[PDB]
Amino acid sequence: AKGKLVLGLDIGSTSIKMILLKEQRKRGEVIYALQSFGMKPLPPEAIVDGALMNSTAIVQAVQDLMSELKVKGKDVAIGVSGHSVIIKKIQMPRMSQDELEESIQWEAEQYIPFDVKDVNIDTQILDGGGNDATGQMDVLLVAAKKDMINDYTTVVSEAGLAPVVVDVDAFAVQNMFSVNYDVPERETVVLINAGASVVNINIISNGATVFTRDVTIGGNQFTEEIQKQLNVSYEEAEALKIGGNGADADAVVPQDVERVLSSVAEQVAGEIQRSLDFYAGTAADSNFSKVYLSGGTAKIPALFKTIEARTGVPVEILNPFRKIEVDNRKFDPAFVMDVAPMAAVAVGLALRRPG
Amino acid sequence: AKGKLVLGLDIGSTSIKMILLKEQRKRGEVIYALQSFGMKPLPPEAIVDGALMNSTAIVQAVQDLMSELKVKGKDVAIGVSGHSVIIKKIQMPRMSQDELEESIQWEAEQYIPFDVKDVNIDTQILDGGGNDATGQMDVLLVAAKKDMINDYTTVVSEAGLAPVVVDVDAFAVQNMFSVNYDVPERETVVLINAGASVVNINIISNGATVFTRDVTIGGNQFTEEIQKQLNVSYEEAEALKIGGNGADADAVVPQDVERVLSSVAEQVAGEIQRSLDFYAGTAADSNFSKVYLSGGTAKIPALFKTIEARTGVPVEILNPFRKIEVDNRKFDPAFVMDVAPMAAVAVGLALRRPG
Amino acid sequence: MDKYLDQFVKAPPAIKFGGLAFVVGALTAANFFMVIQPTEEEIGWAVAERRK
Amino acid sequence: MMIRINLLPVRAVKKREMGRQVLVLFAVVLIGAGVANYLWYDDRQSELEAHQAGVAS
Numbered sequence A, B: 001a002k003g004k005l006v007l008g009l010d011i012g013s014t015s016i017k018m019i020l021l022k023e024q025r026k027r028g029e030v031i032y033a034l035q036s037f038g039m040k041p042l043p044p045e046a047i048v049d050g051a052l053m054n055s056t057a058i059v060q061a062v063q064d065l066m067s068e069l070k071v072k073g074k075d076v077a078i079g080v081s082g083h084s085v086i087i088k089k090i091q092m093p094r095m096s097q098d099e100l101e102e103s104i105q106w107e108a109e110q111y112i113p114f115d116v117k118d119v120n121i122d123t124q125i126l127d128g129g130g131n132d133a134t135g136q137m138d139v140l141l142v143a144a145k146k147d148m149i150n151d152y153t154t155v156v157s158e159a160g161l162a163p164v165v166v167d168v169d170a171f172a173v174q175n176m177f178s179v180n181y182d183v184p185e186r187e188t189v190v191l192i193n194a195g196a197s198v199v200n201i202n203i204i205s206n207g208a209t210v211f212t213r214d215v216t217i218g219g220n221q222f223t224e225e226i227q228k229q230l231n232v233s234y235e236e237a238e239a240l241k242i243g244g245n246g247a248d249a250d251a252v253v254p255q256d257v258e259r260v261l262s263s264v265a266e267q268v269a270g271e272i273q274r275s276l277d278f279y280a281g282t283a284a285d286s287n288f289s290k291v292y293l294s295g296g297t298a299k300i301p302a303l304f305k306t307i308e309a310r311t312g313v314p315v316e317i318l319n320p321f322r323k324i325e326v327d328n329r330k331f332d333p334a335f336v337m338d339v340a341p342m343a344a345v346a347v348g349l350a351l352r353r354p355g
Numbered sequence C: 001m002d003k004y005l006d007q008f009v010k011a012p013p014a015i016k017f018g019g020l021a022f023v024v025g026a027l028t029a030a031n032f033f034m035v036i037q038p039t040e041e042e043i044g045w046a047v048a049e050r051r052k
Numbered sequence D: 001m002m003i004r005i006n007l008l009p010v011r012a013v014k015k016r017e018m019g020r021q022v023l024v025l026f027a028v029v030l031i032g033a034g035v036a037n038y039l040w041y042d043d044r045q046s047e048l049e050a051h052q053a054g055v056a057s
């Protein structure tokens, strides 16, 4: 039933973020526009292995998010953990919708290392509106062990929220750039979301996803190596990462820190070259085009130049908030730009919510 | 039951427009003739993702349209959103009308990424009156998820209107030129309708549609890029587009604006070359002929010359209102010509309504 | 799941019919109560008359 | 030229249909409740006649 819902970053692991865009009126005209945004560091013990495992504490945190937001809306879209979802493509024959859903569940049964006991939702990589009966089916299945979804629904229920869409982050992060992707439509673009629990790669022709791949490595790895090499707590190692790696006065600390994070840098580069090579299936004589970054782990100083020179692709930060109207009297464009990578998904399923 | 109905531009997204043509008597002779026309900027939150999603507000707006029109008629033809309709061709065997409708639904079942739960309506690209039993069937299916149609019927119901035809814009825009197309009947013509939510291409031999293709890019993209690059609201960015791009005193602003819209220009051209190349299936050694433009996004200054040089086809504005009698004492031909591209469909399904 | 608070805030024939139906249901509740009460009153007049 | 008409399919169709069925169910329930109100009225008139016989007694 129509409200403009809301959007949290429920699988932030480092941070629970939430965004309210609705249609803001100006001079008799209206359009999607940022109304509020809030962010709180996730209190751990909330999430373990991608499952919400202190539904109570997470509830109270989400309530703090709603209060800081000053939002009256109580409907929400959210996302599952990348560690909690299996995403992969699947080839079938299209037919009746029931026969597809059953046949989909039958093929993915092979694909799921758990009982069902499992969440199945597909979408077709090409418009069904393009092919004849019995021919040329392609669906991608998102499958999730059951009570990741439960845990999240408990969290949402006691926060006073009502969920309408439980989406996935690798595609929700794309809704902000889906227009700017839709304008170049034979161009192959990569999108990396370097988070705290996982790094997702999704590669597209236009805003048409060609594939996705999720890598266990993330920013938690850099923080954990800093912590190892200076027997620090996770918080002070995290700050040493953030402010340590990027200050103008940091000239003495990129040896001490960079020598700590160098293994992670090499090995991340190795994983990304790994996935990219595992895609290049059909065009044995071509090259790449252009790619963007999201997630706070991206904001590692100089990491964009490093990925650019190492993967042979131009890797650029991007401002999601360009998709939405922003009142300059209520929001500073500079800070908005600063927190854009962390918030990409946080506005992602948020354009999913007035949709 | 025979009235001359009416016609709104219900999926204008930028503007709800409405037109009343009936048969105007002069000197004992009568003919189809413009009786009224009205236009109001669409209040947003009315339409989202091509569905009418504030049926109440849209109702009141349509009532304002009927009042500004001073029309007593309460029957209407309208159109669905291009984002809300799947249009594609389909090959079958012709037979009994029931066997065709069932077989059509069976083949398009493959073509629809939603349950049915879906609108199916076909028409034959060639006269059925040309082929023998079991042979040479071609229908084109218009399929629409169910309550786009519902939402529109609610809007129509509380506006006091009664719908008789729910047509599609890519073909409704053609009824104004269907005569002028019907006079050259081996000539391949392209028709672009650059709207605010979508750009449709339909290409014909005569007034016989050969195909259609809908592109997500539109004028909302140009406006949105202006807004991005000058942190403006959507309305002032839209005016900066309109008056900014076309005034005689605009000599300093096509650098500031054209540098903003240049990506959209390149990428639109890339989409149109894209579709055109994806058609050229059978005549590997031929060229194009002539093409027309409709929709207000077309009226971007110099865009016609740009598309003409870039696509290798003569792209020309056209005056729809030439199909209907216009009393010079009630309407200025100049202004009529000025608002012709926006109103092409708005008179389109309007010649559909006394038909 | 939006289009349904749009439909729930709107209405035309389905909800005009619906409202007519809730009204006739209320009126039938009313007349059934208004035939249950004369029952009780009637048993009362019985108890009086027999006592006479 | 292609002349297409998306009028009376489907969330319009099946919502006019659900709209019809819900009202038919209303009608049936109200007719039954009516019959009940009746049969009650008859047992009550019988009781009234017995009681008026007693009053005559």
Ligand SMILES: Nc1ncnc2c1ncn2[C@@H]1O[C@H](COP(=O)(O)OP(=O)(O)OP(=O)(O)O)[C@@H](O)[C@H]1O
Pocket (backbone or CB within 6 Å): A009, A011, A012, A013, A014, A015, A194, A195, A196, A197, A198, A199, A218, A219, A220, A223, A238, A241, A242, A243, A245, A246, A294, A295, A296, A297, A298, A299, A300, A301, A341, A342, A343
């Ligand atoms: N300036 C910075 N330099 C280096 N690392 C940073 C910086 N800012 C944030 N990070 C890292 O980014 C991570 C948080 O980013 P973000 O909130 O986008 O990830 P997330 O979406 O919460 O994680 P996930 O979705 O993977 O659970 C943290 O691990 C943090 O250490």
Ligand SMILES: Nc1ncnc2c1ncn2[C@@H]1O[C@H](COP(=O)(O)OP(=O)(O)OP(=O)(O)O)[C@@H](O)[C@H]1O
Pocket (backbone or CB within 6 Å): B009, B011, B012, B013, B014, B015, B194, B195, B196, B197, B198, B199, B218, B219, B220, B223, B238, B241, B242, B243, B245, B246, B294, B295, B296, B297, B298, B299, B300, B301, B341, B342, B343
């Ligand atoms: N002179 C102009 N220069 C540039 N753009 C213009 C001009 N006039 C109108 N437009 C643009 O055209 C669009 C409106 O045109 P029109 O009304 O024909 O589209 P529409 O039919 O309402 O949209 P759709 O059918 O795609 O929903 C607006 O986006 C507006 O910004």
Ligand SMILES: [Mg+2]
Pocket (backbone or CB within 6 Å): A009, A011, A012, A169, A195, A196, A295, A345
């Ligand atoms: Mg994230």
Ligand SMILES: [Mg+2]
Pocket (backbone or CB within 6 Å): B009, B011, B012, B169, B195, B196, B295, B345
């Ligand atoms: Mg239009």
